[PDB]
Design an enzyme around this catalytic site. Structure first.
Site: not given
Ligand SMILES: O=C(O)[C@H]1O[C@H](OP(=O)(O)OP(=O)(O)OC[C@H]2O[C@@H](n3ccc(=O)[nH]c3=O)[C@H](O)[C@@H]2O)[C@H](O)[C@@H](O)[C@@H]1O
Ligand SMILES: O=C(O)[C@H]1O[C@H](OP(=O)(O)OP(=O)(O)OC[C@H]2O[C@@H](n3ccc(=O)[nH]c3=O)[C@H](O)[C@@H]2O)[C@H](O)[C@@H](O)[C@@H]1O
Ligand SMILES: O=C(O)[C@H]1O[C@H](OP(=O)(O)OP(=O)(O)OC[C@H]2O[C@@H](n3ccc(=O)[nH]c3=O)[C@H](O)[C@@H]2O)[C@H](O)[C@@H](O)[C@@H]1O
Ligand SMILES: O=C(O)[C@H]1O[C@H](OP(=O)(O)OP(=O)(O)OC[C@H]2O[C@@H](n3ccc(=O)[nH]c3=O)[C@H](O)[C@@H]2O)[C@H](O)[C@@H](O)[C@@H]1O
Ligand SMILES: O=C(O)[C@H]1O[C@H](OP(=O)(O)OP(=O)(O)OC[C@H]2O[C@@H](n3ccc(=O)[nH]c3=O)[C@H](O)[C@@H]2O)[C@H](O)[C@@H](O)[C@@H]1O
Ligand SMILES: O=C(O)[C@H]1O[C@H](OP(=O)(O)OP(=O)(O)OC[C@H]2O[C@@H](n3ccc(=O)[nH]c3=O)[C@H](O)[C@@H]2O)[C@H](O)[C@@H](O)[C@@H]1O
Lengths: 431, 425, 427, 420
Positions: A122, A156, A158-159, A256, A267, A270
């Site tokens: 990035t 793109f 995610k971890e 999201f 990520c 930063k």
């Molecule tokens: O630049 C990167 O390498 C990556 O950064 C993020 O990926 P990452 O930080 O690994 O994981 P996320 O799933 O985005 O979670 C980021 C934070 O947002 C939080 N989160 C996520 C989704 C949400 O709806 N609410 C929320 O509080 C998660 O719990 C976590 O603390 C992006 O999702 C990736 O597309 C991107 O490639």
């Molecule tokens: O409805 C479901 O079956 C799914 O809903 C969400 O899945 P999704 O919304 O696709 O999101 P993920 O790709 O699992 O997570 C994306 C980001 O959202 C965050 N997240 C997910 C769920 C949540 O309640 N809050 C939240 O911040 C995760 O920490 C992660 O960073 C749950 O995270 C899955 O485990 C579940 O299987």
């Protein structure tokens, strides 16, 4: 086939190198860390990214994936080389380009014939010009006349879902300034993208900005929903109902939008900061992103405030338990984790903090030492606790035995930072 | 079912008409005698495609009738919808006078159980005020009549309201009783994706939705303005991020800002709701600030192009409404541009295929109203494309250049690829 | 919740393990004592991505235990899932055996949920079997029965279960609906997409979904075969139709046919159900005819190319399992190809990253098993690409050219575009 | 751009009008001088008013002479009908092609939007070239395929907001010209034959879903499942999708019946049998007998002289089109066994009269239709039928029997029969 080199053993480099090998390419993955390189080769490093350990092991055994420490050895062997090194925050908030340009200089020092250099790291808009210049300067020092192309191919994934995100991406974004780079990249991804060739080709600057705007927009969805959750609390609305109500508009989408105790990870913080800084360098203020940052900073303070407010400011010295330490489920990574903000405040007021995470406790012990109590499982954690914080929504926390929790705890109080629980206890949550 | 709908803006008129189309007996009511009069004679008070015809057939079939008297509609209705405007009040708060007026009329006229459903965009907790207003009128009359209240927010866009009503992405309903739930289910089931929730949460959903869309736009506007300074192409960036299923590809278009009667007022109302509760909506306040500045961009481009020398120049504007497909000019970006052009003594020629009468009501003799797009550009030294009406899409560049004094086009909607063209990002 | 699951096939093992991962206490039961021991010890190879590790951690954590006695697990369970085999008439003896065992052990109210693919109306026989055992015991105990079919695919089972497009549940009681809601609500964080219906409709939904998927495939195979004759490109056609949102872009890939136990089984089950009721599933009968013929296409292209003179030629096959990500060869298109090759006396060399132990069980010394994809092609006059495992995707064509006796590739999954080779594919 | 469109059915008229609305200068041509006189002075939401503004603004003109339009156009669209030996009738398309050849003065792009069998573009080029040859003139041109995906009665929306645009080209000049047309308004470029095939495969897939669901519904009836619940259960799989999964009394219209048949015929001509599509076609033909058979079975074969009512005649809601309508199979059989038939449709009654004359009674509204009826058949799901007053129905009918061919009703006295 293709011979591919990947520089970097972060998630991005390791996952990309491994997946290309799984697809049939001959791949060399390079990093400066000799210890980790040997361990990756040997299969002696714990890896929590789902599926990654076995995928590495099979492709090493098959002879399609090899790890090394010398870029200069890999360059003459490769048809394409990906720079996938870290771009951490610099002291002033801008993206630190030092590792990227170090790789670029090494490539220029070792080049023997035409190669395509793809930057997957990035990097700020315009970075491809600095990378090209660094490579070309090394060719000049050598007095060699060797052709090459540069491209941008941001990542793109995610971890926690990295292999699935890499192997079946919603799209692949590619910045090119040559027909040759476009053809080579097409031939690389065409066999992977069986459902539809969803490579979006564009100019290099636009591909670099695309990565920043994507991460910035995701961070904005989260801070937007956090402000709405916090307001819901004051006016008697249910933010999970609101989320359903708005995510169901196909212009918004249902992903999201989860409010909680903030976003962490290296990520979003930063990259948002670096984009703000790029804007400042150009005389422009990014007011939406500045607000998103301010909101997230305040949101990481809320769990402690809920706890202290429940106890009317009398929390000094209490015992508490925390479920979840990693920044999100499916990793040991604690960079910018909201758990650390909660822990730090709890330690300032002399709380005895009992922690549990299914994977991240070794990382936690690296960061916190003897300052917290490490526990064996979720139930061990809560023994004698006067509050339970659910901070990272690992799946094992989802269906607790509330009876057992109530017997084990000093007080039946759960503060849910991720809005997963409904009680059959006092439950406090966000919104 | 017998239904009454109060209000004849697009929300009340389209919902009333569509309910009739679906077989309900509908009485649609408003205080404006003249507009009702026009409806009785087969002329709609609004610009809404397909609507006048849909009304005509439903009136003929006897399923749809108009009136000015709530009190005569109430005793016939099983369900009454409040769908009156809630415009910005003097202090930015949602003006609730029209809604509570309707609520009080309902309470005066009630003769038996009725469900009252608020479709108007009202602040969270408004359902409590509405019930109280209805109860107070029942208490005056010393009658004892049960009723229920519900929230059913509208997600219609002016100019495409029939399609939005008939094929909605979802229906949101806030209820606090089984009887109300059963009664609304029976109304929507012969149409259909129905989300039942508590009343406060339905009320909040409408503001949050509108606020997230404004957010997308101001986000993309900040990105577009940055793109301009760093040599990135915001159209490619839009494609690059909208292709992520988490973000989506709709409603990401940068331009000269958002306007209309909905986003500016709903965002304001939500920010005010926060302030009343001691909370600051940081993201939304920044979204608002970015949008206000974005409405200045077209003029600033123009002035920078002529190096600050603009006095007495003739310019032409394509598009006056706040968006395509409406006569609505509330908070239109065109008005901010015109105000500034007038301030510096430009001669302003305007064309809109629908909004010119509304513009004339707003601007009088200050601008020149022209007959068509090419008539607008005659003698112009700048053409501003402000509102992306379809007829502007494939212009004759020869015909333009030979009519204009200077071949400059300043595109506030990023529709054109080639003249000198200025655009957003 | 305390949950029991009977059965250690894909469906039983994945459901049990995922429920334990979500924090439930789960007992998973099967008669096979050897396999149960290996599951508790973590000693049986598992090629389902992620599954071996998830079982092991949940066993170690004490949330998942395997056993051989249903009657042991029943008094401890709040919900019990029947996920045993139902191998075009269905053998219901395994499901009913489980049902009777439940009836003999029941101490209190329990919800019995059938996850096995069972004929429509099976819930009535299951309730009757359980009730007979209660009656024989002279106990008066209420219980409910439900249908909760499974929709996961082999190779993506965990992701399919943890993040399903929907959960289908057939119920006839509020008590059962409430209980099932309490199980799934915590999993489905994005939105509650549990679709409640009557029990018969849930049973029918399982067959009808698989039958529609089979229908898309045979439809696209007829279109691909026509495309070859009229000079159109079926990959362009797929993009052209799949982009209509009423059709969708998934499961439209023509090829050498569908295999696996499930599609053929379930298409045939509906055909037979129809026949049992004086009806005929004309579309499904055609779908099955088209699929049978499609499994001959690769051989036919090979024979035609060599003008029918193929005896004694060596050939190589990449891919044996019915799809990538499993060792499962049930109804695999590979076997139809291999049979015809052996019937005309070709020498067959095979390679598959995972399925070769299964292939040897099935074929013995009939084919030669090779060490990797390049070893497979040594001396071959044709290469068939039957199962699109990822390691096959980017081959070193020069190496193949040097190793092969003739540079001919016959691609049954339409993955290749050539950079010296002749490439034959489907449509 | 100067665009010409040949054909004034919904495909040509909507395309022409939508191009004009988007700023193009359009000439729309047909062989019928009275229809063209009417237009300068079909049933389709919004189209009347859109035509009016574009005629007034001088962007849209109607004419009868291809000859006059051709030397004026940059791009000409052939959008004439290809109605059903079962193979596609190409006579209108080729007539248009020959006229274009007779009139060409300079390079033009000919875009075929008519639904035409694979390989038709070769015949079209040959036709145009023979005319250029006859004239001894050397003029280059290109040909393209740009199939239409509009649904009758939702056509303007389908055109303006399409899921995708499909274009077959065999030249860069055609690709640039077509790209320039659509970009100001998701475009999949392919070779010409693949574009032609895509149209047939799309419509055939839609038909397949329907016949698939009709076989499932008919089976549900015999095993005690509810096909509406099955529909929700399978369409919720993203691999399947929830749209266009509705069982009922069959598909009709011009398009699916003729296009399925034409594709089947193309395959036969090429020595291939399309077994899935042939079964789809068979199922749909049988499905159109289901309503009558439910009525006859209900009354135990004793139906002579009974009065019945039909709600809906058009093949689908939102049109007057009755081509291949399920209502016609129902009506013909009712008349055979000597039933007395009362009909109501809010739009299609004049079309019905053309086909049926005095054989049925035409009524004024849904309630008038059911007067003395012993069965009510709901055949086409027009919106005004959705919330009937069941008391009012009860009182007006001789017997409270509703037979629903579109599975829209749930009863709140009545017997309801439906499909699955
Ligand atoms: O630049 C990167 O390498 C990556 O950064 C993020 O990926 P990452 O930080 O690994 O994981 P996320 O799933 O985005 O979670 C980021 C934070 O947002 C939080 N989160 C996520 C989704 C949400 O709806 N609410 C929320 O509080 C998660 O719990 C976590 O603390 C992006 O999702 C990736 O597309 C991107 O490639
Ligand atoms: O409805 C479901 O079956 C799914 O809903 C969400 O899945 P999704 O919304 O696709 O999101 P993920 O790709 O699992 O997570 C994306 C980001 O959202 C965050 N997240 C997910 C769920 C949540 O309640 N809050 C939240 O911040 C995760 O920490 C992660 O960073 C749950 O995270 C899955 O485990 C579940 O299987
Ligand atoms: O475009 C992509 O990135 C993806 O395209 C497909 O993914 P998808 O269409 O989602 O299908 P999967 O869910 O991976 O597989 C479902 C079924 O389709 C089959 N399939 C897939 C691909 C193909 O070309 N042919 C084919 O028959 C598989 O064998 C499997 O039985 C490929 O299977 C993936 O390798 C690739 O990541
Ligand atoms: O509250 C309401 O009644 C309605 O408000 C809006 O509808 P509307 O304001 O009529 O129109 P939009 O199409 O949303 O346009 C709003 C403004 O944003 C601008 N815009 C829109 C989209 C975009 O990507 N970029 C952008 O600048 C438009 O030009 C316009 O000025 C919402 O879109 C509806 O869902 C909502 O029901
Ligand atoms: O009933 C079951 O147990 C499962 O059956 C199938 O899953 P499965 O047979 O394991 O795997 P699929 O990915 O459906 O593959 C079936 C066959 O179709 C082939 N295929 C798949 C997709 C396609 O487009 N074309 C195609 O030929 C595959 O290669 C494979 O031979 C269904 O996909 C699951 O939803 C269902 O739960
Ligand atoms: O070739 C054409 O011009 C058009 O043909 C059809 O459009 P159309 O036949 O006008 O109308 P549909 O809405 O497709 O309905 C066709 C028939 O199928 C029936 N139908 C439709 C959908 C369904 O789920 N079930 C069902 O029985 C309808 O009642 C009707 O009889 C296609 O839908 C269009 O995409 C295509 O462009």
């Amino acid at each position: 086939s293709l011979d591919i080199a990947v520089v970097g053993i972060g998630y991005v480099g390791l996952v990309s190198a491994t997946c290309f090998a799984e697809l049939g390419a001959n791949v060399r993955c390079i990093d400066t860390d000799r210890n980790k390189i040997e361990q990756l080769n040997s299969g002696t490093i714990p890896i929590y990214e789902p599926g990654l350990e076995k995928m590495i092991a099979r492709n090493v055994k098959a002879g399609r994936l090899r790890f090394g420490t010398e870029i200069e050895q890999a360059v003459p062997e490769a048809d394409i080389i990906f720079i996938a090194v870290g771009t951490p925050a610099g002291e002033d908030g801008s993206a630190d380009m030092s590792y990227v340009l170090d790789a670029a200089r090494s490539i220029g020092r070792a080049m023997s014939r035409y190669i395509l250099i793809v930057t997957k790291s990035t990097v700020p808009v315009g970075s491809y010009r600095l990378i090209r210049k660094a490579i070309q300067e090394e060719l000049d020092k050598r007095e060699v006349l060797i052709d090459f192309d540069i491209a941008s191919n941001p990542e793109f994934l995610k971890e926690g879902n990295a292999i699935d995100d890499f192997m079946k991406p919603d799209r692949v974004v590619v910045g090119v300034d040559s027909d040759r780079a476009r053809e080579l990249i097409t031939s690389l991804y065409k066999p992977m993208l069986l459902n539809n060739f969803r490579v979006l080709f564009m100019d290099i600057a636009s591909a670099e900005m695309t990565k920043y705007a994507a991460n910035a927009m995701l961070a904005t969805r989260i801070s937007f929903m956090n402000d709405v959750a916090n307001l819901c609390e004051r006016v008697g609305a249910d933010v999970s109902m609101v989320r359903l109500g708005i995510g169901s508009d196909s212009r918004i989408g249902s992903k999201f939008l989860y409010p909680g105790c903030g976003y962490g990870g290296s990520c979003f913080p930063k990259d948002v900061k670096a984009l703000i800084r790029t804007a400042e360098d150009n005389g422009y203020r990014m007011e939406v992103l500045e607000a998103v940052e301010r909101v997230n900073e305040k949101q990481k303070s809320i769990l402690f405030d809920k706890f202290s407010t429940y106890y009317k400011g009398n929390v000094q010295g209490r015992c508490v338990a925390i479920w979840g330490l990693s920044f999100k489920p499916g990793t040991d990574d604690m960079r910018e984790a909201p758990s650390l903000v909660l822990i730090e405040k709890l330690l300032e007021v002399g709380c005895r903090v009992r922690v549990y995470d299914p994977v991240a406790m070794k990382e936690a012990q690296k960061r916190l030492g003897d300052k917290v109590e490490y526990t064996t499982d979720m139930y061990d954690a809560v023994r004698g606790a006067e509050a339970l914080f659910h901070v990272t929504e690992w799946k094992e926390f989802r269906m607790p035995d509330w009876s057992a929790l109530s017997q084990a705890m000093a007080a039946s109080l759960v503060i849910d930072g991720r809005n997963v629980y409904e009680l059959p206890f006092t439950l406090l949550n966000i919104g």
